[PDB]
Scaffold this active site. Structure first.
Site, PDB file in Angstrom:
ATOM      1  CG  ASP A   1      -1.039   2.935   4.027  1.00  0.00           C
ATOM      2  OD1 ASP A   1       0.117   2.552   4.306  1.00  0.00           O
ATOM      3  OD2 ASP A   1      -2.051   2.211   4.160  1.00  0.00           O
TER       4      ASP A   1
ATOM      5  CB  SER B   1      -5.629   3.101   6.562  1.00  0.00           C
ATOM      6  OG  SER B   1      -5.541   4.313   5.835  1.00  0.00           O
TER       7      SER B   1
ATOM      8  CG  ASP C   1      -1.768  -1.099   1.477  1.00  0.00           C
ATOM      9  OD1 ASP C   1      -1.984  -1.496   2.646  1.00  0.00           O
ATOM     10  OD2 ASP C   1      -2.311  -1.606   0.472  1.00  0.00           O
TER      11      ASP C   1
ATOM     12  CG  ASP D   1      -2.646  -0.348   6.044  1.00  0.00           C
ATOM     13  OD1 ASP D   1      -3.760  -0.193   5.503  1.00  0.00           O
ATOM     14  OD2 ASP D   1      -1.660   0.377   5.787  1.00  0.00           O
TER      15      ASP D   1
END
Length: 238
Positions: A10, A163, A8, A198
């Site tokens: 992030d 998230s 990801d 996540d």
């Protein structure tokens, strides 16, 4: 033996939003012989920026599996395919959100000012324009009433929690897209695939790859939970 890893883009990789924090990780993965595939809820515009800064030139997947981008000639019948579109156009999503905007007090990229978007996300002002260049999805920042999620699903759209925010997209997900890309690599020989997620939008990838890691406390039957991306590299080293 080709090793692939889906990541990801992030806070688990770029805390603070600048690219630099990800460098140590990208470099180690490169040294470990991995093909790094970003599979993010982020737009192509956002991903292209980070990829350039981090010198990653592998294929990538955007807006929750809505499109797969394969650099011209990355893989050695000539299809000449650079973009594989799997989702729905954002205009269709926005047409549906318009019908729910007032009833549920919905706020998303399409009906929010840059100032509002900065407030909602905390993202640096200079990156907002990249996040606004959406092609196949919307992100719901807030609502005044519940029930809109079910309505969207009834309408044939997907509503997936990330998230921090829900993303509205359609006809695809990170897993469906990852599976297709994996097939491209499998034509080159044997491959070992890893996925690091996540949030719930990463769950679809888990049944498609060989090994799964979750950064944080989110639980899944196939995932090994770790506190940091650093730990993922550590556990893989075993």
């Amino acid at each position: 033996m080709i090793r692939l890893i889906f990541l990801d883009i992030d806070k688990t990789l770029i805390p603070g939003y600048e690219p630099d924090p990800a460098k140590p990780i990208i470099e180690e993965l490169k040294d470990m012989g991995f093909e790094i595939i970003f599979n993010s809820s982020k737009t192509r515009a956002e991903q292209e920026y980070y990829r350039k800064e981090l010198e990653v030139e592998t294929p990538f997947i955007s807006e929750n599996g809505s499109a797969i981008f394969i650099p011209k000639g990355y893989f050695p019948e000539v299809g000449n395919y650079i973009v594989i579109e799997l989702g729905i156009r954002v205009e269709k999503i926005r047409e549906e959100l318009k019908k729910l905007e007032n009833i549920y007090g919905l706020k998303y990229y399409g009906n929010s000012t840059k100032e509002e978007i900065e407030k909602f996300t905390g993202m640096p002002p200079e990156l907002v324009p990249l996040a606004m260049e959406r092609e196949y999805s919307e992100t719901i920042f807030e609502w005044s009433r519940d029930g809109w999620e079910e309505v969207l699903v009834e309408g044939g759209f997907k509503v997936t929690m990330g998230s921090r925010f829900y993303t509205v997209h359609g006809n695809s997900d990170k897993g469906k897209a990852a599976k297709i890309l994996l097939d491209f690599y499998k034509r080159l020989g044997q491959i070992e695939s890893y996925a690091v997620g996540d949030s719930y939008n990463d769950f679809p990838m888990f049944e498609v790859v060989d090994k799964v890691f979750i950064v944080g406390s989110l639980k899944h039957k196939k995932a090994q939970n770790v506190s940091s991306i650093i730990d993922v590299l550590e556990v893989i080293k075993h």
